[PDB]
Symmetry: C2
Subunit: 122 residues, 2 copies
């Protein structure tokens, strides 16, 4: 029985979104997506992770939200679910932040992502 810990409400996780100016990248076992039309915004990354024995284990879904609440980016596992490491996730997050910063967006990460980053580099 897996459990999931998330920064996102159900509505934030289930909402459809699209990219006006699409940019995508396969980053090993993870897919990174972002909208290049987005500029000069404050953006927060929010994640959903599987939990196993009180530890954040597998990334299920990450989405980037503007302060007004629009989805402007996403990282997700390839649907074949090949499996990924903590390093794959940290690498993909840094790559997404770099891409969003190009258009002078300021990007921050949720406490869940901070925990994952911290406990992975222990």
């Amino acid at each position: 029985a897996s459990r999931y810990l998330t920064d996102m409400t159900l509505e934030e996780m289930s909402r459809d979104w699209s990219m006006l100016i699409p940019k995508q990248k396969v980053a090993g076992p993870l897919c990174i997506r972002m909208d290049q039309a987005i500029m000069d915004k404050n953006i927060i990354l929010k994640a959903n992770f599987s939990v196993i024995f009180d530890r954040l284990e597998t990334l299920i879904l990450l989405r980037a939200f503007t302060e007004e609440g629009a989805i402007v980016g996403e990282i997700s596992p390839l649907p074949s679910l090949p499996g990924h490491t903590a390093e794959d996730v940290k690498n993909a997050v840094g790559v997404l932040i770099g891409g969003l910063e190009w258009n002078d967006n300021t990007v921050r990460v949720s406490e869940t992502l901070q925990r994952f980053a911290w406990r992975s580099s222990n």
Copy 2:
């Protein structure tokens, strides 16, 4: 960083996104307002093994309030639900425990066997 600062809620859930977002309906609807919570179930369902799964908000690393509970058959169908009243008046662990008890009795009338997730029973203590 003040004494009034409302902290960010995270959510801990037994359910996948599809389990939580899936629509459902009742062939024989049955509802009860149980204090601050709404209980719904399908009276048509019989002879099933059912599991209760929940999504709780987490504040300061503690389970705070029930956001959504759903009852699932072995085949994965939703046959019951407990959710906060639309007005979100606030509720206690005891309100949740009572509503769960009420839902389980209701589902047992038709010879369904009901079990609860690890999260739910942990929320009711005490191991």
